Symmetry: C2
Subunit: 199 residues, 2 copies
């Protein structure tokens, strides 16, 4: 009786989350089309954002300034095997010539069991300037200076592309909160942030 009603409620909640996603999809497509015509749109938006700067390092800003595209996509539209909170984030970096490669990178975030957000590492080519803090390059990671170099690079935005949520205290700090920042604020409300930077 009451148990069967409770299952119906969970069925209904997904149905409406799915209803929203399907309706929002074409609207985001149109919106992003306009966005692709505005020059420093994403640069302006990520500088305007209150909380975002706290997550990343100050030297990351020259590289995140080169972001000319952000695209969040909700995976529950792909399959009923995905939680409605599951999403991919696609970044395009224009790059910095002779330092940071022009590249497109997609990171996928999904619930594992309320459950927690997890991800997998995705390849991104680090800036040349970051060579000394590059975890794939640093030779002595246990040497006094090496430990601090490693830790510094793991705290950059490029460290976050390595984040999984499955190694507490070994990864980019609050990689999950940063992800939700994109899916819940930055990507949905970017236009509000751009108009705020306008006024």
């Amino acid at each position: 009786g009451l148990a069967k009603c409770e299952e119906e409620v969970d069925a209904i909640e997904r149905e409406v989350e799915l209803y929203r996603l399907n309706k929002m999809k074409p609207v985001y497509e149109k919106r992003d089309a306009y966005i692709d015509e505005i020059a420093e749109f994403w640069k302006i938006v990520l500088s305007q954002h209150v909380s975002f700067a706290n997550y990343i390092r100050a030297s990351d800003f020259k590289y995140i300034d080169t972001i000319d595209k952000i695209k969040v996509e909700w995976l529950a539209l792909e399959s009923e095997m995905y939680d409605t909170r599951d999403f991919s984030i696609t970044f395009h970096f224009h790059g910095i010539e002779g330092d940071f490669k022009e590249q497109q990178v997609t990171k996928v975030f999904q619930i594992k069991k309320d459950g927690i957000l997890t991800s997998e590492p995705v390849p991104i080519e680090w800036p040349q300037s970051y060579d000394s803090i590059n975890p794939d390059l640093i030779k002595d990671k246990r040497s006094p200076e090496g430990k601090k170099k490693y830790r510094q690079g793991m705290k950059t935005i490029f460290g976050w592309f390595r984040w999984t949520g499955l190694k507490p205290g070994k990864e980019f700090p609050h990689g999950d909160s940063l992800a939700s920042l994109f899916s819940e604020e930055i990507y949905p409300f970017c236009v509000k942030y751009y108009a705020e930077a306008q006024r």
Copy 2:
């Protein structure tokens, strides 16, 4: 360049329309399920008594002497007003209580209180008649020194006259209690009853 900005403004209109559309969609789907659920609940003896004692913060809103009267609730129904008319916010709702009553002290009675957004905007209400317990005669605003008035105004019966329009003058956190019923207690009552089983 301003033509793009124009399209963005239209997109944000489209997003606001869509979000109300999905809210209405959820309310239409939930209504019949609640009805079926509540028919089973009506078969369970002290369901609401159990649920209201189980809830963490509910008791913090009301006086200790109120509990004997809230023990007599055998029906709580919440109905979302946006299903009536598109003139209501999707946050708008009425809440209907049935009190079994206490012989010689408290009448058996059914009371409906309506909550609605006025301008984000705030939750507001109008006073609804409720027959106070006769134990409360000395703290009944219709019977009253100003120590007693504030004591009655802090009871669950003071909440029934809460409006949200006289800040600092009414039942304290009447909006929070309202939102407790519509967002936690009524939606998730079966979960509270089940948590009381284990």
